[PDB]
């Protein structure tokens, strides 16, 4: 069963590619409470249809670019920046906390 993940487009700067934020949930291997973790997959859009802030289903595909082995399945829920915003503010925060 080729894997399927549901996530969100966060990046749309690339060519025919979209970065998808995929959230996963699970009990901590020892402490027990539900930890929420995530990963970004570089999906693949041929006809450049998928747009930022769209939730999509990812499916395991034939290797494409170095680190781009997934095609996008179908659009789940369109228009929902809400989530992006988070990813974004988190990224921005990164600018802080350093030795520059």
């Amino acid at each position: 069963p080729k894997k399927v993940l549901t996530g969100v487009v966060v990046s749309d700067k690339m060519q025919k590619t979209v970065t998808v934020l995929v959230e996963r949930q699970f009990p901590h291997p020892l402490y027990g409470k539900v930890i929420k973790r995530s990963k970004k997959y570089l999906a693949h859009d041929p006809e450049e249809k998928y747009k930022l802030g769209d939730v999509v289903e990812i499916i395991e595909s034939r290797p494409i670019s170095k680190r781009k082995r997934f095609r996008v399945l179908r659009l789940v829920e369109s228009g929902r920046m809400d989530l992006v915003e988070k990813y974004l503010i988190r990224r921005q925060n990164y600018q802080s906390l350093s030795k520059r």
């Binding site: 402490y31 027990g32 409470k33 539900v34």
Partner: protein, 138 residues
């Protein structure tokens, strides 16, 4: 803020018996009702009736105690010695049926919430299910 309902409840219960009150009030809610539903049928308490305090819905849980002791400090054995939430919020603990715990060599009881509803360890096992293990009480 009130962070955990049940938790409060249990504590009102725990906190009341200890001082020896006849009954104690507590914010109502279908769920909380199903837990009190257990207690009384399990015998830890007399019972409970729905009520309104100045317009708000409350559950009068009626306390149950033991007989008057002899000698000094004739403070009656309490029917509910122990009572604590097991699965807390931000560390929820769900158990598998195999994993359901036996309480106090089976003298106490355990109450979970299965998809077949809120139950007793005994019932659960008889029922072949498992779920959020809400609390220990003995």
């Amino acid at each position: 803020m009130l962070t955990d309902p049940i938790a409060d409840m249990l504590t009102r219960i725990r906190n009341a018996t200890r001082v020896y009150k006849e009954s104690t009030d507590v914010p109502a809610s279908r769920f909380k009702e199903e837990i009190l539903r257990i207690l009384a049928r399990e015998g830890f308490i007399k019972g409970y009736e729905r009520v309104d305090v100045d317009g708000k819905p409350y559950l009068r849980v009626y306390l149950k105690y033991g007989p008057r002791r002899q000698g000094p400090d004739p403070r009656p054995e309490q029917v509910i010695h122990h009572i604590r939430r097991i699965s807390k919020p931000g560390r929820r603990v769900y158990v598998g049926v195999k994993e359901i715990p036996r309480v106090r060599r089976g003298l106490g009881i355990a109450i979970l919430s299965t998809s077949k509803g809120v139950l007793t360890d005994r019932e659960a096992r008889k029922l072949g299910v498992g779920g959020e293990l809400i609390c220990e009480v003995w």
